[PDB]
Design a protein around this ligand. Structure first.
Ligand SMILES: [Mg+2]
Ligand SMILES: [Mg+2]
Ligand SMILES: [Mg+2]
Ligand SMILES: [Mg+2]
Ligand SMILES: [Mg+2]
Ligand SMILES: [Mg+2]
Ligand SMILES: [Mg+2]
Ligand SMILES: [Mg+2]
Ligand SMILES: [Mg+2]
Ligand SMILES: [Mg+2]
Ligand SMILES: [Mg+2]
Ligand SMILES: [Mg+2]
Ligand SMILES: [Mg+2]
Ligand SMILES: [Mg+2]
Ligand SMILES: [Mg+2]
Ligand SMILES: [Mg+2]
Ligand SMILES: [Mg+2]
Ligand SMILES: [Mg+2]
Ligand SMILES: [Mg+2]
Ligand SMILES: [Mg+2]
Ligand SMILES: [Mg+2]
Ligand SMILES: [Mg+2]
Ligand SMILES: [Mg+2]
Ligand SMILES: [Mg+2]
Ligand SMILES: [Mg+2]
Ligand SMILES: [Mg+2]
Ligand SMILES: [Mg+2]
Ligand SMILES: [Mg+2]
Ligand SMILES: [Mg+2]
Ligand SMILES: [Mg+2]
Ligand SMILES: [Mg+2]
Ligand SMILES: [Mg+2]
Ligand SMILES: [Mg+2]
Ligand SMILES: [Mg+2]
Ligand SMILES: [Zn+2]
Lengths: 208, 124, 104, 138, 99, 83
RNA sequence: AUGUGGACCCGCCCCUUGGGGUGUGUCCAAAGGGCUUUGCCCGCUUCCGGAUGGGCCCGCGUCCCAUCAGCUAGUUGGUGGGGUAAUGGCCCACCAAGGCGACGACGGGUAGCCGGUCUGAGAGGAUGGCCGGCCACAGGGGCACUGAGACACGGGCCCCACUCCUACGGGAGGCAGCAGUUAGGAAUCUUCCGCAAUGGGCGCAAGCCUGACGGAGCGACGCCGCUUGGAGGAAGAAGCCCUUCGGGGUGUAAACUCCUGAACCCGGGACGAAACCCCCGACGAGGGGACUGACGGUACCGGGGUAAUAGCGCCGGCCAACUCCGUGCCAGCAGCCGCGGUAAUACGGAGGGCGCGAGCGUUACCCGGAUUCACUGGGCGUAAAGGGCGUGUAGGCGGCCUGGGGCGUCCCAUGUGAA
């Protein structure tokens, strides 16, 4: 699956600006920019008061599409954050942020998570030295995520990591631009993430 | 009831009455068609519904709805059965599986195709 | 530890054997209430010594016959036919409970 | 005959407070006393005394109520919202110390009888004993 | 076909017979001893009880008896012999018995 | 008789045995008498052989009867100190 | 024959069920083989002890029907005897006349039981498939032999049923072992490799045997990981959407802008395997390279490299998603309520949308929601539910005070609760 289709139609249905096109979503043509109505031939008509289901459903899809993930993998992560000790709503977000495909995107090796995903699969990313090619591999803390040696001279990286000069990264990552090797210091707290998402709903959605 | 009464008598549990003796509690039964009659509906419906009496390998003789537009069920066509109550014909509590054995799957159907057992149209 | 029960002799009508009645109160698995419940043991009495009425200690023994696996250890208190009468009337009820009537 | 005298007392009290009696007379027993002793100490009554009534021994029980309230129905909040006989004759209820329940997250109590005497929930757990569980009160 | 552990069958038969005879010798001697005691012929009854003891203990050297099975058989024997003698006998040769 | 041997407990292509006292008539992977150690023949971990060496010598003392492999492993942990 | 010793009858002491000691009497032992030969190896005999395995007995627990209420002749107990490794009516002769049952005996129905498994907030409900433990069976029914152990799946005998041989008298069989065929059925795999690993049987060993096992094969049957990368318009021989041959949507979504490189090609290439054995040292000495890989040239590492499968259900309410045309109580839909009678978001198509995605639906069955058998946790004036009324048997239940006991109840320690 991986969805893998027209991403900006999902920017639009959920209603909030979404970074799936990673690069372009910053230009005045994110389609959410100056066309912010849903897809379809009812895109622009007046929408009635959604059921509580709707509300929870959408807030969940909103979250799942951010990280681009099959519901299979997603619900597995969620049950695991319930079973787990600690406020279960936000243990979720920490697990979701601990995904390698995502940690690569956070460190601006890639412009989209999607791009970052295909970057891992093609063995361009290392972890503690060794190669890893699983988008779902879980980064623990202390782990040093490098760019592949042979991939060091590749186009997209040369470009992408150069534009990473200047930029800051969340206070749980420690990217080093010289030798392209960030470090995963800490599981991110809820205030760290500026996700346009109300996970309380997300919990409540599986609370059915 | 008193505790003592409960200790003496107990509660009594419930029994499942199954609305499908397709026997074995099997999920499908094979059957040989007897009649391919037509039947009228009740309460507030009117039409001519395609039903079939079927002789079962479970050794049963039950009527069974033939879903879909056109069918090809002769006096002796063999056929598969699944559970399914037709709300309108009373005493019809099974469906014929369109697409298996002698029952051709509905032709020219583009929409809900896995029911009605029709192959992917050759639109390639 | 060979099990040791305590009970009431309710029968002396056997050769070197005495039926002992052992009562056991336990609380009910689902309904919580304590329920009395009982069982008859045939016990070995090698000297036709124990008489109908007394209360004896019964002990787990090497078998002595078909359904006779206990010997009579010591005696607790002497006579008390109340227990037997209780056990007697209980039996007498059965005389009814059939097709007609009987003794209540 | 009066089958469960303890239950009767708890009721007798429940019944008296709903019509806001000053005090109520319950037939005396060493046991009903050791309950009121707790009921009193945990602040649910003003206390009890051993009045004689046509020669036979009772226990006058002085009940507490909240302050006079306002709007329609000025009647005061009860201090005994709730009082329930739990172990009843012919369904006796015993708890181990591990099984002693938390009543009202502890804004209420549970009187219970132990071989260390009659105690509250907190009293018993501190003392590490279970017993027959007489009643809830919150 | 022909699993050549039907050889076990051949042997089983061969043995069956060895046991079978060993036992009949005991049964016929033990009987004879008892029936001799029950006549007060004591010297003759012990001279023969003693044979029967041996055969028994011997029987139990191979697999024909072994065990407390032989012990049993001896216990049943000497006990019976003494009683039929104690109906007026006075254990003459007093071979196998200790009075 | 009672033996000391290896009972297989790994995964396909991923063997781990448990060094086991058991009656020889038993299933290989069935009910045993006592576990007394384990073996990771692939040494995927720095701890790939471990023997309760006191206990090993106990069972040996009353006629436990090691497989030739089990004895290797036992020897290595220095059960019988051949010194 | 020798009697270390052990068995047996009678005694003697301790013990207490047949545990241990002791005395006279009686009875009971044995096997040889190999040598790198007079001293080593494997054996043999009796006894005591350990370890492992097992027999038997007992308490408690273990589904449904009372439209099954009475049951029982070895039946219950006894004395004696047979039998066993051993208790026992297990069996036998004789004697007593008992034993069981509403706390469900007798009968009938169903079923291997458990560790666990699914469900559930829990109490509970449901279940016993993989794996592990126990029990029972080996075409059906009986039986003993052999033996430490069997009443013995690939041992024996007899009877029955079926199949094959038959010179017609008589003989041969037994996949519920691996694989395989056939039938039944909605439905369930290869007549594959290997003795390398673990395990077992025999052998001093070398070895041998092992469809135990370790592996491979088939099947989205289940779980987990993974790919299909993604930046552009729209002429109907019966087939591109939305106000009458008309107004926007599909949608940044492309058959072509770079970038990466599943498949596929080439090269290296394993762990699992060190013991058994030989050698020094004493036939277990830190020496054995003595040798051993089915899986398999697979996994894994490196070099080359192509833009490279998408489906299925759904869109009236419950329930996330609406428009056009066809149809006109017809064709049909439907889990429930319900939709279709000419303007149908419910039928059939189309565009568009929603959910999931190597899957998606349907059927079937279990728990759930169901506090709808209610212990937690329900009810019965009128909704279903007080017996037509009494008497009282069994049972359930029991005022105040004191003392003993400690059965219920509570507490501490400990043993078990394997994997
Ligand atoms: Mg042979
Ligand atoms: Mg001799
Ligand atoms: Mg069965
Ligand atoms: Mg429930
Ligand atoms: Mg068969
Ligand atoms: Mg048979
Ligand atoms: Mg043998
Ligand atoms: Mg034998
Ligand atoms: Mg058998
Ligand atoms: Mg066979
Ligand atoms: Mg087979
Ligand atoms: Mg078939
Ligand atoms: Mg297979
Ligand atoms: Mg081997
Ligand atoms: Mg296998
Ligand atoms: Mg190696
Ligand atoms: Mg070898
Ligand atoms: Mg809706
Ligand atoms: Mg439909
Ligand atoms: Mg219309
Ligand atoms: Mg429609
Ligand atoms: Mg619908
Ligand atoms: Mg998958
Ligand atoms: Mg329920
Ligand atoms: Mg209730
Ligand atoms: Mg109700
Ligand atoms: Mg009425
Ligand atoms: Mg009524
Ligand atoms: Mg009335
Ligand atoms: Mg009464
Ligand atoms: Mg009473
Ligand atoms: Mg009382
Ligand atoms: Mg007590
Ligand atoms: Mg415990
Ligand atoms: Zn966007």
């Amino acid at each position: 699956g991986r969805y893998i289709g027209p991403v900006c139609r999902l920017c639009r249905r959920e209603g909030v600006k979404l970074y799936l096109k990673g690069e372009r979503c910053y230009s005045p043509k994110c389609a959410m920019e100056r066309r912010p109505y849903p897809p379809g031939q009812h895109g622009q008509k007046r929408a009635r008061r959604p059921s509580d289901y709707a509300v929870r459903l959408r807030e969940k899809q909103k979250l799942r599409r951010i990280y681009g993930i099959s519901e299979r993998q997603f619900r597995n992560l969620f049950e695991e954050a319930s079973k787990k000790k600690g406020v279960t709503g936000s243990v979720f977000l920490g697990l979701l942020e601990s995904r390698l495909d995502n940690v690569v995107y956070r460190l601006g090796f890639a412009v989209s998570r999607r791009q970052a995903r295909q970057l891992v699969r093609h063995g361009h990313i290392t972890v503690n030295g060794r190669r890893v090619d699983l988008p779902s591999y879980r980064v623990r803390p202390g782990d040093e995520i490098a760019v592949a040696e042979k991939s060091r001279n590749l186009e997209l990286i040369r470009q992408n990591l150069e534009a990473m000069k200047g930029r800051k990264v969340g206070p749980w990552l420690s990217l080093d631009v010289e030798g392209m090797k960030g470090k995963f210091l800490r599981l991110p707290d809820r205030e760290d993430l500026a996700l346009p998402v109300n996970e309380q709903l997300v919990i409540e959605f599986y609370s059915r | 009831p008193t505790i003592n009464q409960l200790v003496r008598k107990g509660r009594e549990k419930v029994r499942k009455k199954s609305k499908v003796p397709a026997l074995k509690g099997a999920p499908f039964r094979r059957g040989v068609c007897t009649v391919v009659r037509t039947v009228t509906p009740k309460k507030p419906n009117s039409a001519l519904r395609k039903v079939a009496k079927v002789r079962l390998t479970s050794g049963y003789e039950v009527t069974a709805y033939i879903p879909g537009e056109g069918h090809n069920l002769q006096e002796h066509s063999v056929v598969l059965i699944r559970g399914g109550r037709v709300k309108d014909l009373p005493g019809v509590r099974y469906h014929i599986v369109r697409g298996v054995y002698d029952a051709a799957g509905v032709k020219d159907r583009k929409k809900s195709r896995s029911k009605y057992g029709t192959k992917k149209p050759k639109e390639a | 530890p060979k099990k040791v029960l305590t009970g009431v002799v309710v029968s002396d009508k056997m050769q070197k054997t005495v039926t002992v009645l052992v009562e056991r109160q336990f609380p009910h698995p689902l309904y919580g209430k304590v329920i009395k419940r009982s069982k008859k043991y045939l016990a070995h009495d090698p000297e036709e010594k124990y008489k109908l009425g007394d209360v004896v200690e019964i002990i787990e023994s090497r078998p002595i016959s078909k359904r006779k696996r206990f010997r009579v250890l010591r005696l607790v208190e002497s006579g008390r036919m109340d227990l037997v009468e209780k056990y007697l009337i209980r039996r007498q009820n059965y005389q009814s409970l059939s097709k007609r009537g009987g003794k209540a | 005959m009066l089958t469960d005298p303890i239950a009767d007392m708890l009721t007798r009290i429940r019944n008296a407070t709903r019509v806001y009696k000053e005090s109520t007379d319950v037939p005396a027993s060493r046991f009903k006393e050791e309950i009121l002793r707790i009921l009193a100490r945990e602040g649910f009554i003003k206390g009890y005394e051993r009045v004689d009534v046509d020669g036979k021994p009772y226990l006058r029980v002085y009940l507490k109520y909240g302050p006079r309230r306002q709007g329609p129905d000025p009647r005061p909040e009860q201090v005994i919202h709730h009082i329930r006989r739990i172990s009843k004759p012919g369904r006796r209820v015993y708890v181990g110390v591990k099984e002693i329940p938390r009543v009202r997250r502890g804004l209420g109590i549970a009187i219970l009888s132990t071989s260390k005497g009659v105690l509250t929930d907190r009293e018993a757990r501190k003392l590490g004993v279970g017993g027959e569980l007489i009643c809830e009160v919150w | 076909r022909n699993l050549s552990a039907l050889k076990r069958h051949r042997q089983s038969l061969k043995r069956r017979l060895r046991n079978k005879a060993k036992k009949s010798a005991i049964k016929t001697l033990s009987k004879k001893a008892i029936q001799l005691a029950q006549e007060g012929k004591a010297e003759e009854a012990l001279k023969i009880m003693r044979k029967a003891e041996s055969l028994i203990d011997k029987a139990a050297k191979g697999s024909t008896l072994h065990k407390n099975a032989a012990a049993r058989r001896k216990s049943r024997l000497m006990r019976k012999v003494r009683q039929l003698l104690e109906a007026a006998g006075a254990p003459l040769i007093g071979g196998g018995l200790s009075a | 008789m009672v033996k000391i041997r290896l009972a297989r407990f790994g995964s396909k292509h991923n063997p781990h045995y448990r060094i086991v006292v058991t009656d020889a008539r038993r299933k290989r992977d069935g009910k045993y008498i006592e576990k007394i150690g384990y073996y990771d023949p692939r040494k995927t971990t720095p701890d790939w052989l471990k023997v309760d060496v006191e206990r090993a010598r106990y069972w040996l003392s009353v006629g436990a009867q090691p497989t030739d492999t089990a004895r290797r492993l036992l020897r290595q942990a220095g059960v019988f100190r051949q010194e």
